[PDB]
């Protein structure tokens, strides 16, 4: 499994050599390009993507699109080594500090820190409202998990996130219902012959950055595979109504 940087910055010797051993092992050709990049005297300096700023004139779907293209520009991590250690139960303010230092450094990003970045970017807009979604799925005799960030601006459901695949990480605000969104995710997942087993939905995140409220991820959980989609849709629409009225607590 992919390992996590924990020495702050810069990267310590142990994690450095561990990552290089990992990439040497997995890469079939292996040592040639690895050693070439190690002993490369000069390499092209990557540019710094500029953090976009909210503007009132331009519309909110284009805002979500803009954050999505910036995230795409940030070169999604497939090196197999996390660079910013995240804790689920940690209070929100620590995650805001993590998000702002991550934007300062602008390194490769995975799904969890991608949705944290999305929360950090969208925290400035009371009209926009966002929450997490998680899937636990089954394929090839092993279980895998994925996480994305849903949005409910202007009475419409949309999705942001990251993945090595293309269509599993970005949807627009064009969904009347949350059920249509999650079933679209299920169909895209089936397109790769991966079976979703369980689906989990949390809560709207508070709009105050400097707070200690933790992020909820398990407030709703279903076993999607066993049950027929009608009951799933009914329970999900009940839950969406319970959420947008702020009743759940």
């Amino acid at each position: 499994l992919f390992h996590v940087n924990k020495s702050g910055f810069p990267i310590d010797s142990h994690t450095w050599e561990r990552m290089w051993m990992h990439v040497a092992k997995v890469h079939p050709k292996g040592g040639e390009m690895v050693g070439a990049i190690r002993n490369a005297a000069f390499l092209a300096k990557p540019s710094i993507p500029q953090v976009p700023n909210y503007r009132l004139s331009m519309t909110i779907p284009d805002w979500l699109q803009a954050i999505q293209n910036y995230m795409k520009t940030l070169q999604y991590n497939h090196t197999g080594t996390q660079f910013f250690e995240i804790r689920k139960m940690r209070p929100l303010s620590g995650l805001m500090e993590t998000a702002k230092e991550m934007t300062r450094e602008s390194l490769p990003i995975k799904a969890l820190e991608a949705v944290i970045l999305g929360i950090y970017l969208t925290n400035g807009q009371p009209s926009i409202e966002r929450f997490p979604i998680s899937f636990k799925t089954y394929f090839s005799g092993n279980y895998f998990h994925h996480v994305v960030l849903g949005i409910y601006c202007n009475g419409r459901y949309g999705s942001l996130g990251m993945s090595r695949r293309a269509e599993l990480m970005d949807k627009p605000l064009t969904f009347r219902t949350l059920s249509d969104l999650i079933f679209d995710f299920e169909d895209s997942y089936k397109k790769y012959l991966h079976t979703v087993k369980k689906v989990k939905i949390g809560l709207y995140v508070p709009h105050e950055p400097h707070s200690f409220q933790p992020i909820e991820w398990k407030q709703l959980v279903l076993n999607v595979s066993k049950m027929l989609r009608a009951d799933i849709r009914k329970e999900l629409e009940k839950y969406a109504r319970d959420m947008r009225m702020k009743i759940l607590k």
Partner: peptide
């Protein structure tokens, strides 16, 4: 002084390496 150059080198090499493995995943 040299610390910032170290971060520069680190991000440059890791960016290039990530490009290489993205190409490999395209191969896969």
């Amino acid at each position: 002084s040299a610390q910032q150059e170290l971060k520069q080198r680190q991000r440059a090499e890791i960016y290039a390496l990530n490009r290489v493995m993205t190409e490999l995943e395209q191969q896969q």
